[PDB]
């Protein structure tokens, strides 16, 4: 246990959703902030390569803009 560690991640560090075996964990990659399907309902291409990466709303204007 360090820092991103999925091993707790089981809240939502935005909105502060419960997870569970219901819903699926996601993690934005660019912030490194664990996120829910809520959070996490993005996807935004980078400059460094031809794919679309999935980061939070946040994250989507930083690389919108
Ligand atoms: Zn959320
Ligand atoms: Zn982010």
Redesign the pocket.
């Known amino acids: 246990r360090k820092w991103a560690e999925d091993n707790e991640v089981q809240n939502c560090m935005a909105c502060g959703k419960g997870f569970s075996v219901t819903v699926r964990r996601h993690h ?1 990659r ?2 490194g ?1 664990i996120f829910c399907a809520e959070c996490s309902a993005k996807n935004a291409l980078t400059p460094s390569s031809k794919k679309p990466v999935r ?2 709303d ?2 989507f204007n930083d690389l919108q803009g």
């Open positions: 934005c660019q912030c902030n980061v939070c946040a994250c």
